[PDB]
């Protein structure tokens, strides 16, 4: 059972959640993949590094790809909170990712 | 295998296709459900009537819900073609539908 993006907050840290949406922004810096996932409610940040089983799939993501993602909620890094997002204090550590469109 | 929404064309008439996207517009008229499904490639029309197994699920659709749909491609009926859309000569008769968000 999924959450809408903005139903996830600092209250959910430690929980495993499922979200479904589309890629608003994909970013890759220092080997770490950051995906802003958009759904009807708004945005949540997915984070994936090479130790995750989802990483290879995460690397194929492009803007507007349809994604169904599962992972654990955690706080964003020190000084990395985004005050303009409802979910801006947290991110989802990506454990599983399905790209519903082709590759 | 999915097609991107606007990869579906006249050459696909009669074939079964799978598409994934979000609801751009939901319309219900005369008991028939019309969904403009949007993905990275653009829009395609899904059509669903009460004789479809996917009808009860289709009734739950709202704008911006993430959908994964399967159905048969056909020509839009005479006079119903929409030349303002790439896929405007065709539509998908909905046979199966999954709503990936909570509905």
Two tokens, residue B57: 């699920």
In contact, B88 and B53? CB cutoff 8 Å: no
B56: nearest Cα among B23, B22, B33, B29:
B33
What CATH class is the domain A1-103? mainly beta
- Token representation of residue B68: 């994964």
Q: Which of B1, B65, B68 sits opposite A40 (nearest CB)?
A: B65
Q: Would you call A76 exposed, middle or buried from its count of C-beta atoms within 10 A (0-12, 13-18, 19+)?
A: middle
Query: What resolution does the deposited structure have, in angstroms?
Result: 2.0
Q: Under DSSP, is residue B90 helix (H, G, I), strand (E, B) or coil?
A: strand
Interface of A with B (CB under 8 A): 1-4, 20-22, 39-40, 62-66, 68, 100-102
Q: Taking a C-beta distance cutoff of 8 angstroms, is the pair A65, A23 a contact?
A: yes
What is the distance between the alpha carbons of residues A56 and A59, in angstroms, rounded to a whole number? 5
Chains A and B: how many Cβ contacts under 8 Å?
53
Where exactly are the structural domains of chain A?
Answer: 1-103
How far apart CA A23 and CA B16 sit, in angstroms, is 27
A22: chain B residues, CB-CB within 8 Å: 22, 39, 66
Contact A98, B100 (CB under 8 A): no
**Chain A residues with CB inside 8 Å of B25's CB?**
none
Strands (E) in B1-103, as ranges, are 16-29, 32-39, 42-48, 66-75, 90-99
């Amino acid at each position: 059972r999924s959450h809408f993006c903005t139903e996830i907050s600092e209250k959910d840290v430690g929980k495993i959640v499922k979200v479904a949406g589309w890629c608003n922004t994909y970013r890759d810096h220092g080997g770490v993949v950051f995906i802003d996932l958009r759904d009807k409610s708004g945005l949540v940040q997915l984070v994936c590094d090479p130790s995750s089983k989802a990483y290879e799939k995460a690397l194929e993501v492009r803007s507007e790809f349809v994604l169904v993602a599962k992972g654990k909620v955690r706080l964003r890094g020190a000084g990395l909170e985004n005050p303009k997002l409802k979910t801006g204090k947290i991110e989802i550590v990506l454990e599983e990712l399905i790209i519903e469109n082709k590759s």
